[PDB]
C-alpha cells in the first residue's frame, strides 16, 4: 500500500472541493460538522437515487446543498413533495435557510462513484466478482471514456484466503496532473466480511 | 553552559527570564 488519493492529488488542478466557503477560525469546525451531518443524511436517504457528489455552498446563515444524481425523479418524488420532505428535514438540522438543488448527471457509466456502487451491490448480490469487474470496465469504455480501471479487494466469493482482483482498459495515468481521472470508492458488506471496490475513470487530459 | 540556569546562556535555553537574564 503506497498510492495517493487521485482526488486529493488533483485538488486545485482538476478537482474542485465538494464544500466551498470561507470561515474564520472561530467557526470552521461548526460549519464543517454541519457539512458532515448533512452529507450523512443525504448519502443515506439519496442512496437509492444514485448519489454521486454532494456540493455544499454557504455564505450568510444559508446553505445550498447541490445533489448530483443518476435518477433525479427519485429524489424529488411526487411533484416536489419528497424533495421538500428533505428540504425541511434538512432545515430542521440546518436551522439556516437550507436551499436544495438537484442536478442531472449526463452519463451514469461515466461517474466513477457510481460504477463502484454498482459493482459493490453486484457482489452483495453474489455475482461473479471477476465477471462483474470486466462488465463494468466495459460499460465505461463504451460510454466514451479514454480509460477505466476497477478493483475489488477482500474475500472474493467468500474465500477464506482474501484476495485482490482488477481489470483495466484504455489508459489510466495516475501520475499525470492534467489528467482528469474521476475516482470513486464503494464498500460492499457481505455475510463473510467486507469488500472494497475502487473505480478509476480516465475522462481526458485538460 | 546551556544547562546552567543561573546564567544568561542557560536562560536563553529554557526560554525563560530572571535576574540572570532580564528584559
Amino acid at each position: 500500500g503506497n498510492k495517493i488519493h487521485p482526488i486529493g492529488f488533483r485538488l486545485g488542478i482538476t478537482r474542485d472541493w465538494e464544500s466551498r466557503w470561507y470561515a474564520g477560525k472561530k467557526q470552521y469546525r461548526h460549519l464543517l460538522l454541519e457539512d458532515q451531518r448533512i452529507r450523512g443524511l443525504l448519502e443515506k436517504e439519496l442512496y437509492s437515487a444514485g448519489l454521486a457528489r454532494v456540493d455544499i455552498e454557504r455564505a450568510a446563515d444559508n446553505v445550498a446543498v447541490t445533489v448530483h444524481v443518476a435518477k433525479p425523479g427519485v429524489v424529488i418524488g411526487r411533484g416536489g413533495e419528497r424533495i421538500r420532505v428533505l428540504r425541511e428535514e434538512l432545515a430542521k438540522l440546518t436551522g439556516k435557510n437550507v436551499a436544495l438543488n438537484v442536478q442531472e448527471v449526463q452519463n451514469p457509466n461515466l461517474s466513477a462513484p457510481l460504477v463502484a456502487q454498482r459493482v459493490a451491490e453486484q457482489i452483495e448480490r453474489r455475482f461473479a466478482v471477476r465477471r462483474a469487474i470486466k462488465q463494468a470496465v466495459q460499460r465505461v469504455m463504451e460510454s466514451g471514456a479514454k480509460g477505466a480501471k476497477v478493483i475489488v479487494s477482500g474475500r472474493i466469493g467468500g474465500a477464506e484466503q482474501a484476495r485482490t482482483e482488477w481489470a483495466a482498459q484504455g489508459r489510466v495515468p495516475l501520475h499525470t496532473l492534467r489528467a482528469n481521472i474521476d475516482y470513486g470508492f464503494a464498500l460492499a458488506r457481505t455475510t463473510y466480511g467486507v469488500l472494497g471496490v475502487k473505480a478509476y475513470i480516465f475522462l481526458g487530459e485538460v | 553552559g546551556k544547562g546552567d540556569r543561573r546564567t544568561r546562556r542557560g536562560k536563553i535555553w529554557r526560554g525563560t527570564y530572571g535576574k540572570y537574564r532580564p528584559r
Binding site: 485538488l11 464544500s19 460538522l33 | -
Partner: protein, 60 residues
Amino acid sequence: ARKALIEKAKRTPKFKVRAYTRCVRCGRARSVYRFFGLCRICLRELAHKGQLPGVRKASW
C-alpha cells in the same frame, strides 16, 4: 470502553480542567486538532475527499 467515552467527553464536567477534545467524526482522543474538530487521521481522509474547504496538499 469507547462509546461511553465519546459521551462523557461531550458532557460538561465537574471541573473545567477535566475537559478533553475528541474527534467529532471517529471519536479518537489523541491528535485531535482544535481548528477542525478532527483527529490527524480523519483530517487526512476528508482532506483527500475535498470535503475540507480550501485545504490543499502542501508542497514546497
